[PDB]
Amino acid sequence: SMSYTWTGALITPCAAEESKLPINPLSNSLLRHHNMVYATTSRSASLRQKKVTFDRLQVLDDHYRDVLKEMKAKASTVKAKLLSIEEACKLTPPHSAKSKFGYGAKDVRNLSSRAVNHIRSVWEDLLEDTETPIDTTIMAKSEVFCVQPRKPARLIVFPDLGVRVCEKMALYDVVSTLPQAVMGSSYGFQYSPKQRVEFLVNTWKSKKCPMGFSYDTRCFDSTVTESDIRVEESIYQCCDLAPEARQAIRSLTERLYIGGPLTNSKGQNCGYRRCRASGVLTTSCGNTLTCYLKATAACRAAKLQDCTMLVNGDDLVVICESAGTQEDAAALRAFTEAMTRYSAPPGDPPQPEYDLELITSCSSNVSVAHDASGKRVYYLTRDPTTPLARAAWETARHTPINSWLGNIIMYAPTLWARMILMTHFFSILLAQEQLEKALDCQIYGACYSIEPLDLPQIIERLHGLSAFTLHSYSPGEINRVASCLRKLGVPPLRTWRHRARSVRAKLLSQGGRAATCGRYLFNWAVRTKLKLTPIPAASQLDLSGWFVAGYSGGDIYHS
Ligand SMILES: CCC[C@]1(CC(=O)O)OCCc2c1[nH]c1c(Cl)ccc(Cl)c21
Numbered sequence: 208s209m210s211y212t213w214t215g216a217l218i219t220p221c222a223a224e225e226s227k228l229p230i231n232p233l234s235n236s237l238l239r240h241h242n243m244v245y246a247t248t249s250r251s252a253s254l255r256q257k258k259v260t261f262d263r264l265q266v267l268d269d270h271y272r273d274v275l276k277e278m279k280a281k282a283s284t285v286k287a288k289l290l291s292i293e294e295a296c297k298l299t300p301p302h303s304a305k306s307k308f309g310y311g312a313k314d315v316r317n318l319s320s321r322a323v324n325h326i327r328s329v330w331e332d333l334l335e336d337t338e339t340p341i342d343t344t345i346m347a348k349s350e351v352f353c354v355q356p357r358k359p360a361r362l363i364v365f366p367d368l369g370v371r372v373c374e375k376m377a378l379y380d381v382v383s384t385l386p387q388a389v390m391g392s393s394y395g396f397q398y399s400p401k402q403r404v405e406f407l408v409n410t411w412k413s414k415k416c417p418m419g420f421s422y423d424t425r426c427f428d429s430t431v432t433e434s435d436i437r438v439e440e441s442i443y444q445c446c447d448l449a450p451e452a453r454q455a456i457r458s459l460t461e462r463l464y465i466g467g468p469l470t471n472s473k474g475q476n477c478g479y480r481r482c483r484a485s486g487v488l489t490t491s492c493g494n495t496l497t498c499y500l501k502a503t504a505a506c507r508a509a510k511l512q513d514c515t516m517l518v519n520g521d522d523l524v525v526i527c528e529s530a531g532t533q534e535d536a537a538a539l540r541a542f543t544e545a546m547t548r549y550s551a552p553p554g555d556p557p558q559p560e561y562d563l564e565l566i567t568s569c570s571s572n573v574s575v576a577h578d579a580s581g582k583r584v585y586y587l588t589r590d591p592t593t594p595l596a597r598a599a600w601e602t603a604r605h606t607p608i609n610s611w612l613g614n615i616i617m618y619a620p621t622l623w624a625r626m627i628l629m630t631h632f633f634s635i636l637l638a639q640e641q642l643e644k645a646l647d648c649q650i651y652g653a654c655y656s657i658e659p660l661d662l663p664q665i666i667e668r669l670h671g672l673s674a675f676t677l678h679s680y681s682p683g684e685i686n687r688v689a690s691c692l693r694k695l696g697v698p699p700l701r702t703w704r705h706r707a708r709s710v711r712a713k714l715l716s717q718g719g720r721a722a723t724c725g726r727y728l729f730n731w732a733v734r735t736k737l738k739l740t741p742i743p744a745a746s747q748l749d750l751s752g753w754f755v756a757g758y759s760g761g762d763i764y765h766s
Pocket residue numbers: 621622625626677678679680685700701702704731732
């Protein structure tokens with residue numbers, strides 16, 4: 208069937224949309240080529256619609272069915288509990304889209320009578336009505352990028368707040384535990400960046416003659432079929448479930464997950480969806496299981512030997528045994544045709560790689576540096592173009608989500624996050640005296656409230672003390688960073704070092720946690736290095752639940 212059917216009504220914005228980076232002294236000191244930074248808007252929605260609208264092709268075979276059964280057998284060991292209204296309400300982000308039924312996120316979190324009563328009625332409706340399609344709103348997503356040598360806005364589809372709370376009650380436990388039970392070590396969201404690197408490195412080292420490749424599915428969500436979504440439900444149904452949870456899952460699958468009507472911000476009917484909605488609780492878990500299922504079966508069909516998968520939603524990386532250059536190229540081509548038959552066609556044809564560092568997965572690649580002892584240490588990095596473009600935007604315009612904070616946390620060991628992001632934002636936090644102000648950021652889709660002053664402890668816990676002592680980065684990494692700065696008009700690294708010396712001094716002069724930031728985060732900025740010992744409060748932080756599962760689009764807030 209067609210991924211989407213459109214009426215002609217436009218995908219509309221619910222307010223003015225900013226698309227250009229402002230000329231601001233704060234952002235200008237970080238990035239001068241402001242005209243190269245832009246944010247997507249509803250104005251490009253039609254271009255996106257054209258690309259994601261097509262008739263799907265899908266042919267399942269014995270390999271697919273064999274793998275599905277293997278996955279279901281593992282799912283059969285799971286027991287999901289069903290969340291209480293209170294637990295579900297608490298998982299709701301303070302700024303989550305309000306309901307069109309008289310209440311907002313603040314009301315849900317406060318357990319107001321109106322919110323609770325409506326949520327209970329939505330729940331009962333899921334139990335009684337097993338067929339009526341549930342309404343969803345479609346909007347153009349606002350994301351910042353650097354112009355290319357532009358991308359149209361992505362389309363986000365989500366149901367009302369009441370429904371979102373019910374999804375949590377019926378499926379939060381399932382999507383938080385089933386993926387790992389089913390895919391084991393291949394489930395990417397169970398790893399912190401350091402653990403992801405460890406898995407990739409050990410997997411690569413375990414092969415007699417390693418070959419790897421990332422597989423980019425062309426607009427994955429639109430390739431997900433009704434069959435795929437019911438197969439996904441068949442996996443969830445293997446869990447021991449409370450009766451109402453089982454019915455809720457069955458109803459949500461038929462009324463929301465497999466498709467439904469699309470309404471714009473103006474309340475007009477835009478069309479119908481018959482593929483994955485980006486904004487529902489099961490999107491991350493569902494995409495991961497679907498991608499893992501198709502890829503695992505495709506490897507068998509393609510005759511790729513000993514394939515180890517690492518899946519994060521629609522992002523896939525595969526490491527296997529090489530059978531020779533020509534043989535690998537042919538097998539990969541076969542893999543792709545198998546994926547295509549499973550309705551997982553390629554965006555960019557995959558390419559075999561024989562250098563782990565040359566593989567980009569989850570927009571990242573493994574690279575190497577050295578710790579204080581001079582010992583080699585692998586870490587996760589990525590092209591800094593987007594992170595920098597967004598940091599500039601977030602500097603000139605106050606945004607709900609602070610991607611720069613999430614990037615500092617996830618890429619703390621990198622050359623660019625240390626010399627640029629840390630230096631830039633801590634200097635601004637010092638000037639505005641807001642070091643104590645907690646900010647929101649996202650990690651694997653979930654929203655987290657974090658205090659900048661806790662960064663040292665957070666980083667130590669996630670990356671280890673070596674994150675504060677890495678030096679002698681690779682030639683390729685340095686070159687990539689440096690060329691990126693020239694392209695964006697970002698001052699050269701030498702300038703950032705100079706700026707950091709002053710930031711570090713100011714931090715030390717304030718003592719307390721501020722001084723600890725100066726000592727650990729900016730030890731790279733002083734000639735005579737300080738001996739960095741474990742931070743006491745670091746072994747007391749509760750990072751439980753930080754790297755357990757993915758929730759992109761799941762409307763999840765962690766406290
Ligand atoms: C995180 C900074 C690391 C390190 C040391 C290193 O990489 O050996 O710390 C001192 C300043 C500095 C470093 N790397 C740099 C590079 Cl590639 C370019 C320019 C400068 Cl000015 C630096």
